[PDB]
Design a protein around this nucleic acid. Sequence first.
RNA 1: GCGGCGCGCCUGCUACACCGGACCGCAGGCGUCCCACGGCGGGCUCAGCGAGGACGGAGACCUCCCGCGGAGCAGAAGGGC
RNA 2: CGGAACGGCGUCGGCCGGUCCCGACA
RNA 3: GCCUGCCCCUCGCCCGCCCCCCAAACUCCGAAGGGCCGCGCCGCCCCGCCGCUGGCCUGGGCGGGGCGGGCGAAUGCGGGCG
RNA 4: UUCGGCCAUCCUACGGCGGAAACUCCUUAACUCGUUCCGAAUUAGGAAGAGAAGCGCCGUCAGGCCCCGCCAGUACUGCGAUCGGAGACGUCGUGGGAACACGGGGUGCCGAACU
Lengths: 164, 51, 285, 153, 189
Amino acid sequence: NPMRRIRIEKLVLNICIGEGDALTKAAKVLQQLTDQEPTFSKSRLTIRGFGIRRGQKISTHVTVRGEKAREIIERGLRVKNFELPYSCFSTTGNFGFGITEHIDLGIKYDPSMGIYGMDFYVVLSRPGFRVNKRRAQQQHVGASHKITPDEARAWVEREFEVVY
Amino acid sequence: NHTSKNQNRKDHRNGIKKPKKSAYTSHKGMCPKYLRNLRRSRANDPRQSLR
Amino acid sequence: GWVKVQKTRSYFKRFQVQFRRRREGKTDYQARKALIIQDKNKYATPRYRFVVRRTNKDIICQVTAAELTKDRVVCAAYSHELPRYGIPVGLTNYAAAYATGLLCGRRLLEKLSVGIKENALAQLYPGLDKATGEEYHPDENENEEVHAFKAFLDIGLARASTGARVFAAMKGAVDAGLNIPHSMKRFPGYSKDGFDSSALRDRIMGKHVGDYMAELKAEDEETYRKRFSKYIAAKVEPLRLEAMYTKAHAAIRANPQAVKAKKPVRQARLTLKERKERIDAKKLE
Amino acid sequence: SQGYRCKTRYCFARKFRRHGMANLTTYNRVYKLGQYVNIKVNGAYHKGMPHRYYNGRTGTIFNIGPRALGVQIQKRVRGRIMLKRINVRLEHVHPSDCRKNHLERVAANDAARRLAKETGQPVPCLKRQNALPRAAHVVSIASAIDITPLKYD
Amino acid sequence: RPARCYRYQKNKPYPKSRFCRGVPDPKIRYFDLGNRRAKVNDFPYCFHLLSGEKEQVSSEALEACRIACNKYIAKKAGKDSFHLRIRVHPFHVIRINKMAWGKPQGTVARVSIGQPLLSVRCRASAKDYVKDALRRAKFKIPGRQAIVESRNWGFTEFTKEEYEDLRERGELQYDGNNAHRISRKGPLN
RNA sequence: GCGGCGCGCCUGCUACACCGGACCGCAGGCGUCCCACGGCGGGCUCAGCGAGGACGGAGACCUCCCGCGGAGCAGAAGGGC
RNA sequence: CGGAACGGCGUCGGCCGGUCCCGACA
RNA sequence: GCCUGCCCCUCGCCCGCCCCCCAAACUCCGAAGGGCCGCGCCGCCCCGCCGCUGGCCUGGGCGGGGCGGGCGAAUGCGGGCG
RNA sequence: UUCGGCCAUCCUACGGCGGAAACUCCUUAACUCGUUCCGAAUUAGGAAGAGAAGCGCCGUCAGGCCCCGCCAGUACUGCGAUCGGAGACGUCGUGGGAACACGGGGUGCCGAACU
């Protein structure tokens, strides 16, 4: 069925800096890569070991969707050498990898910016995944329609030719 | 410090008295708008004891 | 590894199912209660709701009195019926919604009027004949004696936004004389202290689609053929959309009365003995 | 301590799987002055709440008002029954039956008199009866079962 | 303080909770004794010490009764031939007004008349000695307690005859030291 | 007398299923705090498992899943959502 | 003969099992 | 078994299934027992009134006739009011 | 289908089977509006696809939920006892009578408008 074809719903890149100058400068790196403004996520607790105080923005994230997602996912996967661990596939079907630095994407390093890693998470969807998102008649996606971890590896090997 | 022995006997000696009949049809606590209309309707009918 | 089962016998024993129409996702009972509520001193006199529901292919405006065990739909007009009135395509667009609403108002007022068939009713409240969006409130402009039929909009789970199609139908029945309470702030043309009666009539007449259709044809004819295939097949020219809807608004006013225009197999459920054998077949292994 | 909702843990608490909002029949039931209503509090609805005493008390409607009903309840204080007029919101009042046996009986009592005017001249007694003695019967003892007290275990 | 005093019920069940903070721990801490890991078929004969009075047995009595029972059947046979279960647990706290509300001191098991108090699961070798050990326990416990032999197999609820038919078909399911039926409900797989 | 303060009030209990019921009987509160921590409309889902994601570990943060509320709602407790 | 846990081969009445003309080694 | 190993053997550990015993401040349940209320003036047809209600000619209240009727558990017993 | 009533005999999990119409998924951001960021939602504009889901059915020694049995005249308990017992407990009238287990059998139905 053409209605059972997997796709990339979204790519969420998180830079968990854990300094505000640093946080904002990582927002700029996310902004340049995705072209959409990132949102900041606040601390949910105070931990002295991690040097974190509650109520302080600790991380930045941008939800990149569409062909821009496919482009960034490909650039990031190439940094990994198109090698993705076999475990990183979740029981829900989604998978993710983390890169260190931003120059490996190809964004030129500028002394104006700093050097920082991105945690790339990729969510996979099938046509019909809006039934658990609609305000009216929100219903859970049927188990058959739902993507399986193995059937997600199959889709990603075909698409970016990644090897486990 | 407290007793209820003989309270009930006393209550039913000549008691459990019903609450009159006036209270049943009283207009205290009824809606002002209902009451004003009831006065208007009886007043404009030939039933009304108007001069 | 070994994890707890969140859905145990206990979870199921203590679970309270929500109301069917909430579980279905069809109804919000907070809104419903407030729309349905009448003061007790008004007794059983019916309170009427103007329910507007939008499907993938249709807009249905329904006037619905609430009863004790049922909801009575006094009159309903569906956008599927609008090609009888000359709108052959875009039957879910803003202009269609205004006309489906206009059909609802005219049909209801006329059904009530055929009850008087004499002095004052659907004639006492004629409705705006032209469709300028110009802040018409038929309820209290004049009234006296007979009063404008009053209904309250039930948008439903639809989000009330400036430019929503739910408002279009409401302006539409207000333009057929139904009194529906409004503010003209969620209808196109409103800013701060002023309301432009042209911008409301531009969407109500189809200008937004006409401009897109023409722009798509000029910039990329290939997209125009794919995006507006039915419109092109129905020979609907964009710079003629305003007259098509203007004559549909006239037609709906003239003849609101509505013409009244299988079974799947459902394999039979097994009787107990058949299941009592089916387990035995599985059991014999 | 004796606050308004003292000793109410088990009476103003929702029923096992009857928690949450209420059937909308509560707000669409039409009541008329003089109607018998049963006061049963709802924990979820707090405005218009009768005191614990009022729970389980039948009464008549004296005022039909916007939003709330006025109910006259005969409360026994000491040696006096006092009429107490309480205004309750719709969530706590239920149309009482109370006179449902009588209203049906009065109607069926009319039926025999209507049949007297029509065919079926003899009129049945319409006074209710309290059981009366069992009367004479003939019982077949052919299949009598001899029951016996038995040994102790 | 004597058990000639706290024997009778004069306080409603008072558990060890947020209402009974800092409570004295019970003298009886071991309730399953003997071969507790022995299987159901190993020990067919079961015996009980019942109560002839509704009273409150102290944890001191329940513990003295336990040492007495075990030592005897283990010196007479083995610590591997019987399973001894204290069938009453000391969950009621007893109060003393030390020198007017009493401080929490001591724990009493409020036994009921006709209630198992001590059960033994034994092999054929110790059938002779069990009623003797349970007799020694009787002196340690207050009241007219009364010994009995259960006409049921093991600590299970199946009668000795009932066990045989189910075991012969295989309906009887072996469940550690106890046993239950195979069940005709649930997914067939 | 000392000591308290069931000297005015509030929650669950003893309290005996309408109501009512006691004790220097049982476990606790109150004398405040807040122009938002208020009103109102919208949108939202909570605590969390389970799996998954550079530094990242037990706990920093980002995702999906199922989530009867197991969170929250200023401050006692019990109801309520 | 207020009275208990416990004793009694005091005496009557029961309940449940074992042996005995294969005499309860001759 | 081995440079060491998760190459592992057993326990604590989690998860399921059982089981001994529980609660004044636990309840899926739920008595006995008690409570509140009802057990007579019913229909049918019109007609009057109202600043109240309402899309209406709708209700709802309070009246006024007329018409088919009729006193509808037991047992005791005159009740009320200053 | 839209609106409802009562709110599990309707829920939950998995497995099928089905769509002409309807519903949905769907397909685009010129406009409108909309996203701590994101057309995911939502708003608007569509019609190229589709039963893969949601939904409609049917399953499943299914869980739960419902119903009738049985438990059991049991447990408890109203009234009377110069009843027993040293008591705490129990009988005997004479009236009420559960519950958990366990066994079987079920698995929404109604009222408006439209098609």
